[PDB]
Amino acid sequence: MIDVAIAIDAESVEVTWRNRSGGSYDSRGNATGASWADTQIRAAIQPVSGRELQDLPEGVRSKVTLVAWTRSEVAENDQIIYLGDAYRVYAARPRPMDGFTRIALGKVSP
Amino acid sequence: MIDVAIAIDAESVEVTWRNRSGGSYDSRGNATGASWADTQIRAAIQPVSGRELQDLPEGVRSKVTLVAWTRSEVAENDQIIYLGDAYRVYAARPRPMDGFTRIALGKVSP
Amino acid sequence: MIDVAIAIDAESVEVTWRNRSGGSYDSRGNATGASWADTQIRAAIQPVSGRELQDLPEGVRSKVTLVAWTRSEVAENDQIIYLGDAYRVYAARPRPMDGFTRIALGKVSP
Amino acid sequence: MIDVAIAIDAESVEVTWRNRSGGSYDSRGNATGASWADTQIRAAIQPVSGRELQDLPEGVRSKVTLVAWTRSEVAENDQIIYLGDAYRVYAARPRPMDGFTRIALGKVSP
Amino acid sequence: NPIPAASDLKTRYPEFTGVSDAVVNAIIAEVNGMVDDGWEVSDQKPAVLALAAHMLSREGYPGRATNPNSFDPTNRPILSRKVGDVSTTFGRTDGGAAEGGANSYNYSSTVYGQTFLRLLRLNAPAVGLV
Amino acid sequence: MRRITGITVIKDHQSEDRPALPYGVVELANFRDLHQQVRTIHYEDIEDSDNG
Questions:
Q1: Cβ–Cβ under 8 Å, residues E107 and E23
Q2: Going by C-beta distance under 8 Å and a sequence separation of 6 or more, which residues neighbour residue B99?
Q3: Is D53 on the interface with F (CB under 8 A)?
């Protein structure tokens, strides 16, 4: 009798998964990114080295990273909207023997 | 009474081993790679640092790695077809006292 | 009552130790390596980072390393023939309080 | 009731301590090293990264290091003759609360 | 026991083929006393043939040791070992090690002793009158 | 071992023990032609040959 992902249910939160399908290129060489599909989903987010300040000459900006451990299937280039801001997926470590993955998220807004 | 590889049987999956024998060179200097032999086999694959995104100027591509722990004998330059994609073997750590090895796999398709 | 090397006897294998004595130089400046002496001996070899592939422009070749833990006395520059191939000794850690050493082996054939 | 150095007595060996006192310079600028004093003494030597081979263009030579844990007082620049060869002291970690030190030894003969 | 079984256990127990003077003359003479004609014909030969081997294997090997000279007068068991950085752990045997005797002779150490024990209990019931 | 100096000289990349405390070593770094074109071409008939 197997249930490991039952641990991810103790702490979770509603983040909007945003699955992506690629586009193509205009005859002039430009790029067209399209085909987003949204779905509310549950994750277990933890702040592994989040919100590092950067006082560049151009001003001040932060560097935010996170980890996910979600039950659904998420690829390497998708989006997850959490706490009102979008995060792009660095890298996933899927475990198909069970149902869950592990994801690195970086904040998109500069 | 000895059985250690009995642990690799708990989790396993059918991957197609693809054993390789080398070729030679055409008189004009080119290369000819040939002599593949295929065989369905059982492994225990785990995602040790898999699917790292790379947003190069040329576009987007992923960097996938895996580990094997298989019972059969696999050399250092063979192929393993898993989940519909081919993987090339980095390095093996054979343990001839027992029957099993340990292999690093990198995805081939760019 | 002391017996530690009794652990090395659980796993062992017949490798041909090849003890070396140096030579000298021809009057034209060349070198002459000679004076090998062979002896079958028992070791306990383990694959610590063995068989790393290298896909150089010149082609494909592997990088093999091993550790020994043998009971006999082996210097820093000798040879050990194992599994049909020769290995040269990197570095030894003799423990004269007991009888055994620890050796790093690198494959010779390019 | 205190006895910690009683552990160093389990394994020990007769090495010749060679205590040093400095010299001075000849009026032409040269150096004169003198004033050695010898004494048989007991130590507990262990091969921490000993006998690393070096195949330089000039030939072959080894790189030997050791640790001491001796009960007597040894400074940072002395000599210890062990196994027929001299060793120079890198660095000591004296523990005057107890009686013992810890020493790094490097072989002198090139 | 008309015939002290000699030089035959090398054929019965193939592992013992090192020395024969220490077996026939030095050891078999120490066993052929325990067997009695009150036994059964099918047991007098095998039982002594087993007990001699138990006595041999009690020491290192037929004479005091095997070809290597690594023998222990105390049969200290080896509980664990590790060879990626040599280490061993042994047992404690002072009067009786573990579920073992301290005033009798333990016949239940090796399999040969257990075979001798199983024949002994069968052929020799214990009852007296005096 | 050079005739001029009195010491032992050895080749560049060998796998032998260091000979003594004073000694020498010679290596070949590179070489090249010096002029852009040839000086002469020498023609010579092979001893006892035949082209058919």
A1: no
A2: B5, B71
A3: no
